[PDB]
Amino acid sequence: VIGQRKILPDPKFGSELLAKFVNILMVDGKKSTAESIVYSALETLARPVRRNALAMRWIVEAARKRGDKSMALRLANELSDAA
Amino acid sequence: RKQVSDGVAHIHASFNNTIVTITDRQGNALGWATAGGSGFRGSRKSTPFAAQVAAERCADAVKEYGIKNLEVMVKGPGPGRESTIRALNAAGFRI
RNA sequence: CUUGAGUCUCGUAGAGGGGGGUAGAAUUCCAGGUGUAGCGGUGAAAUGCGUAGAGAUCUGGAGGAAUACCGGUGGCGAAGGCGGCCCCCUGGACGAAGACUGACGCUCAGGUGCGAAAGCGUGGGGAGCAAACAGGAUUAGAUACCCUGGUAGUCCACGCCGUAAACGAUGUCGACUUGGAGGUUGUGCCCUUGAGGCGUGGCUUCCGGAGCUAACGCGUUAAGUCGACCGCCUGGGGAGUACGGCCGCAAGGUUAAAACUCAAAUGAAUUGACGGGGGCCCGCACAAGCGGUGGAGCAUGUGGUUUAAUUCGAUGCAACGCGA
Known part of the structure; x- marks a missing residue:
């Protein structure tokens, strides 16, 4: 067997527990947009590869056609409701 | 019929x-x-x-007789011997 | 004469046989209650049971069959074959020393006897089963298969049959020729503990040497090496048939051809093919995740419609944004 891919820690905070999250809410290779999505939701709110990955995917996967101003900020509400 | 909470179950x-x-x-x-x-x-x-x-079925047929411990004296082997035995024991009876 | 053969003396093991009773497990109905919607089964129902009390329970009976464990790589028997317990009668085998006889032997055509199962005949017996036969459905139709009953038979006595892949597909008797691994049953020496350690017989299972064999295999229980006598074979089919004889209660058996036809039939082994009795391994093949196509409008391609033509080829994966 082989281990899971090792990703460099999120440069902005130098922490590994945030890069994996921003890579899956990402769409179509648009990482640059991803920070515009989640950092606005994060910087302004103020085996380990099975259950954390699956549960956190469920959070991202319900923001496609909810029909409001912008799901960019709706997911901020969703995580605010979650938190 | 007797409310003795005893007897046998001739399977x-x-x-x-x-x-x-x-x-x-x-x-x-x-x-x-x-x-x-x-x-x-x-x-x-x-x-x-x-x-x-x-x-x-055999349980519910005698659940009204006040019996809570029935022994098993089975006559011959049958399909699902463990299934019937477990189902009968699940009814709240002692062999 | 005594080495073969036998007689004797003493023990051992054994489903060897014939009888005689003997007991339970299971077996069905009745004898009763306990019980009312079931019992039953296949490809599927159904046929047959039952609510009139059906199954099961315990209770006793009835009666027949057969003796689960032991149990076996076991045993005994000429073979067929023999399996609960116990008695009576009985047969054979083997071992230890000794005595006795004194070649009394081996094999045997003919002959004689025994001889699974089915069957037959005569009387019984019949608990289960089970050819036949009887219901249902079959299947392409069903007189399939099946399930439900079920009679002969199966069991006993006597008589007949006299046949089997009655097979180790290996006649009987003797002698000789390396080993290894067992089992069963005696017995000698020494452990005088029970086995024991070492012999030594008989039976028996399996490897394998030489040898033999076409090969497979056999291999001291030979298919080796020999000797005695017997039986048998002579291409396949016709055919173990016809005819005759003998035998049998018909039932059939035994002995046993020919015409004709074919150029094979056959044994053993080799390769590799279905081989619907296997495993193992690998792979975005599955598991996880990501993104999608099948909905629509156009682009192109493919089949189909018409037209003179809609040029031809490509047309599962390995044609269809292909040749172009």
Whole structure:
């Protein structure tokens, strides 16, 4: 067997527990947009590869056609409701 | 009929249908139920499901007699011997 | 004469046989209650049971069959074959020393006897089963298969049959020729503990040497090496048939051809083919995740419609944004 891919820690905070999250809410290779999505939701709110990955995917996967101003900020509400 | 909470369960475990009686220690039957004819008949009989449902039928046929411990003296081997035994024991009885 | 053969003396093991009773497990109905919607089964129902009390329970009976464990790589028997317990009668085998006889032997055509199962005949017996036969459905139709009953038979006595893949597909008797691994049953020496350690017989299972064999294999229980006598074979089919004889209660058996036809039939082994009795391993093949196509409008391609033509080829994966 082989281990899971090792990703460099999120440069902005130098922490590994945030890069994996921003890579899956990402769409179509648009990482640059991803920070515009989640950092606005994060910087302004103020085996380990099975259950954390699956549960956190469920959070991202319900923001496609909810029909409001912008799901960019709706997911901020969703995580605010979650938190 | 006697409310003794005792007796034996003569399991007439035949291949096609296992038709268990509830007789006392003396040797007189209390209440009866059957697997075949009692909700299903065919060549698809002789299954552990049939033995289990026969066990629950034989239980509910004598659940009103005030009996809570019935021994098992099985006559011959039948399909789903463990299924009927487990189903009968699940009814709250002592062998 | 005594080495073969036998007689004797003493023990051992054995489903060897014939009888005689003997007991339970299971077996069905009745004798009763306990019980009322079931019992029953296949490809599927159904046929047959039952609510008139049906199954099971315990209770006693009835009666027949057969003796689960032991149980076996076991045993005994000429073979067929023999399996609960116990008695009576009985047969054979083997071992230890000794005595006795004194070649009394081996094999045997003919002959005689025994001889599974089925069957037959005569009387019984019949608990289960089970050719036949009887219900249902079959299946392409069903007189399939099946299930439900079921009679002969199966069991006993006597008589007949006299046949089997009656097979180790290996006649009987004797002698000789390396080993290894067992089992069963005696017995000698020494452990005088029970086995024991070492012999030594008989039976028996399996490897394998030489040898033999076409090969497979056999291999001291030979299919080796020999000797005695017997039986048998002579291409396949016709055919173990016809005819005759003998035998049998018909039932059939035994002995046993020919015409005709074919150029094979056959044994053993080799390769590799279905081989619907297997495993193992690997792979975005599955598991996880990601993104999608099948909905629509156009682009192109493919089949189909018409037209003179809609040029031809490509047309599962390995044609269809292909030749172009």
